[PDB]
């Protein structure tokens, strides 16, 4: 039945109001996978909001969203929810739900995204000990056919006690939700072509594309899930000259 995460439609709300965004899962056993939520302010990187374990209803939040976002689940309908309260203009963004697996600790399936616009308009549509992910370059212009190489550095080793390194790469095509490309440093996710290859260790990682094709254009994000909270790199936009 192939997995699908279907979110509710775009929202237009007044400042101060609340919104409850839904994420209906189908094609898998809802209570066997953590559901994670991500915020993406227009033109910015991805931000981890929090996770919910549908089996227990237990949650964990990014410190900055704790007290702002409330994650719930309805197991009968296999639906996860995120309510955001006291909305301001800074809450306007695209929010995603995404399934998180255990073997890779990666986000294998993403919802299509829900655009929230906080407005009076009638129509239209910190640091601490967190691991920091730095991507270089910010932007990589090429001619189609060129090879490409982009780097991702972590503020500390991503080697985990169990010996694995939970560093993944995602590709977000213009206007779409991110998609998993490589999980755990060098493993290609299902359907990802051989021209993509991940390498590196510890705090130094690289993604290579031996030959850039049109379908490869977009923004590449690295992320780490070896340490909590989960963190994302700032993004590298791959575009044509």
């Amino acid at each position: 039945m192939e997995i699908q995460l279907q979110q509710s439609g775009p929202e237009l709300v007044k400042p101060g109001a609340s919104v409850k965004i839904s994420c209906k899962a189908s094609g898998y056993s809802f209570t066997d996978y953590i559901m994670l939520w991500v915020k993406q302010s227009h033109g910015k990187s991805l931000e981890w909001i929090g996770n919910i374990n549908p089996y227990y209803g237990s949650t964990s939040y990014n410190l900055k969203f704790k007290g702002k976002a409330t994650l719930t689940v309805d197991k009968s309908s296999s639906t996860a929810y995120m309510q955001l309260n006291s909305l301001t203009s800074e809450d306007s963004a695209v929010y995603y739900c995404a399934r998180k697996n255990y073997y890779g600790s990666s986000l294998d399936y993403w919802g299509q995204g829900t655009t929230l616009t906080v407005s009076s308009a009638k129509t239209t549509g910190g640091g601490g000990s967190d691991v920091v992910m730095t991507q270089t370059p910010f932007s990589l212009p090429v001619s189609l056919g060129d090879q490409a190489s982009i780097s991702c550095r972590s503020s500390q080793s991503l080697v985990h006690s169990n010996g694995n390194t939970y560093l993944h790469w995602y590709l977000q095509k213009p206007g779409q939700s991110p998609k998993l490309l490589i999980y755990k440093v060098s493993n290609r996710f299902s359907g990802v072509p051989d021209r993509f290859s991940g390498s590196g260790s510890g705090t130094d990682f690289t993604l290579k594309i031996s030959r850039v094709e049109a379908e490869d254009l977009g923004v590449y994000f690295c992320s780490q899930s070896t340490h909590v909270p989960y963190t994302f790199g700032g993004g590298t936009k791959l575009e044509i000259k």
């Binding site: 209570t31 066997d32 996978y33 953590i34 994670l36 996770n51 374990n53 549908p54 089996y55 227990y56 998180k100 697996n101 255990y102 600790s105 985990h160 939970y166 899930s225 070896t226 909590v228």
Partner: peptide
């Protein structure tokens, strides 16, 4: 055992 992603 559920549903687990990491720690």
């Amino acid at each position: 055992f559920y549903p687990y992603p990491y720690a």
